[PDB]
Amino acid sequence: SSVILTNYMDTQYYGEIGIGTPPQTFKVVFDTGSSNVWVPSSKCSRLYTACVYHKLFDASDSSSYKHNGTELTLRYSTGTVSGFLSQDIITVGGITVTQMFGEVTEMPALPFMLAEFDGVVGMGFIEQAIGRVTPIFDNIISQGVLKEDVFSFYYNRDSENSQSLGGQIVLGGSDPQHYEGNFHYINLIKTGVWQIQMKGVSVGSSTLLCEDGCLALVDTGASYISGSTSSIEKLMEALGAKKRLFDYVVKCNEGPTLPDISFHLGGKEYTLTSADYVFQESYSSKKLCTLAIHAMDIPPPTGPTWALGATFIRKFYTEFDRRNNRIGFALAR
Ligand SMILES: CCc1nc(N)nc(N)c1-c1ccc2c(c1)N(CCNC(C)=O)C(=O)C(C)(C)S2
Numbered sequence: 001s002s003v004i005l006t007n008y009m010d011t012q013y014y015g016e017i018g019i020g021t022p023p024q025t026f027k028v029v030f031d032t033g034s035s036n037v038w039v040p041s042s043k044c045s046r047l048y049t050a051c052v053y054h055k056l057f058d059a060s061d062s063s064s065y066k067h068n069g070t071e072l073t074l075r076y077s078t079g080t081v082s083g084f085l086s087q088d089i090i091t092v093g094g095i096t097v098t099q100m101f102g103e104v105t106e107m108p109a110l111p112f113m114l115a116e117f118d119g120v121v122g123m124g125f126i127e128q129a130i131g132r133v134t135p136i137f138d139n140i141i142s143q144g145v146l147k148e149d150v151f152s153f154y155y156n157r158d159s160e161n162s163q164s165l166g167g168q169i170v171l172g173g174s175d176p177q178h179y180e181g182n183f184h185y186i187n188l189i190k191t192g193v194w195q196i197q198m199k200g201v202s203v204g205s206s207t208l209l210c211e212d213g214c215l216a217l218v219d220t221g222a223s224y225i226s227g228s229t230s231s232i233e234k235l236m237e238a239l240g241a242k243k244r245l246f247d248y249v250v251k252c253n254e255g256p257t258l259p260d261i262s263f264h265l266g267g268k269e270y271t272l273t274s275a276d277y278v279f280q281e282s283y284s285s286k287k288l289c290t291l292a293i294h295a296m297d298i299p300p301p302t303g304p305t306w307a308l309g310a311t312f313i314r315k316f317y318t319e320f321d322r323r324n325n326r327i328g329f330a331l332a333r
């Protein structure tokens with residue numbers, strides 16, 4: 001099953017799922033970086049403007065609902081949400097699984113007032129699941145309907161014409177329609193986290209990063225590519241970029257000439273070009289352009305580490321293999 005994803009500024013990719021009976025529609029992201037499923041709850045106080053600007057799941061409207069009510073909190077790098085648990089059927093691209101999801105009731109304006117989507121569908125292992133709530137892709141594998149215990153992602157480039165698909169997530173395989181060449185898999189440095197071994201990050205002619213190795217989290221739930229303040233500060237100095245509050249910028253007219261950044265993975269350089277990582281809004285020297293690379297200090301047990309978000313996935317189609325604890329990579333198409 002494949003699920004079309006909408007592209008919002010190269011910073012937000014989400015598809016559609018259906019919770020309840022009758023189905024109550026929800027825009028959600030498929031986050032390989034988390035492990036729970038949550039959606040804005042109808043029980044959320046409208047003092048959280050975020051809930052006023054999003055879709056709310058009501059249980060008094062689903063006959064296929066099963067109350068639980070345990071409270072949980074999902075802490076993300078860029079923001080936190082909170083609420084209680086509930087169970088009900090969920091429809092994801094043709095498949096139907098009964099799931100335990102988070103009915104969020106505390107959803108902060110900043111950042112969620114900037115969420116084009118409503119909730120999140122964790123694609124990570126149950127090992128990271130908060131509340132030990134069985135993840136969904138696990139629930140789907142319990143059906144033995146998928147041809148392969150793998151799911152892939154395809155993030156497109158923010159096109160300006162409503163006709164191109166923002167992206168696509170296939171459950172059970174890897175659509176050939178969007179990658180050329182063949183996949184190059186790397187094994188997970190451990191099962192329970194979609195993280196792998198990275199053998200250096202190079203910026204042109206100088207592997208002035210991740211020498212002696214480092215960790216790499218393949219996060220479809222992250223907008224950009226991140227490292228640790230140390231790593232980034234050093235990378236960001238090698239470009240002539242300036243630090244702001246939440247990102248870096250380089251006089252726009254110098255973006256087409258920034259250098260390549262290659263991420264050594266599994267024994268194959270994955271290279272990115274200025275065009276790949278810079279939001280080239282303008283070509284002037286009197287304006288500033290943002291880099292699709294940020295600093296994020298991911299806390300253990302996963303951190304410190306680099307995060308390979310949508311900036312990196314836009315160039316390389318990703319396959320997530322649950323059956324072999326390995327992540328595949330192919331050039332985007
Ligand atoms: C998709 C959930 C998610 N998963 C992980 N692993 N990390 C995150 N930082 C987020 C997470 C949380 C909140 C926001 C956010 C991402 N993003 C980035 C969206 N990322 C993608 C891949 O679509 C936003 O833009 C805000 C609305 C500010 S709020």
Ligand SMILES: *[C@@H]1O[C@H](CO)[C@@H](O)[C@H](O)[C@H]1NC(C)=O
Pocket residue numbers: 067068069070085
């Ligand atoms: C919620 O689900 C968990 C998962 O097994 C279960 O143990 C618990 O009893 C449920 N909560 C309640 C109060 O029903």
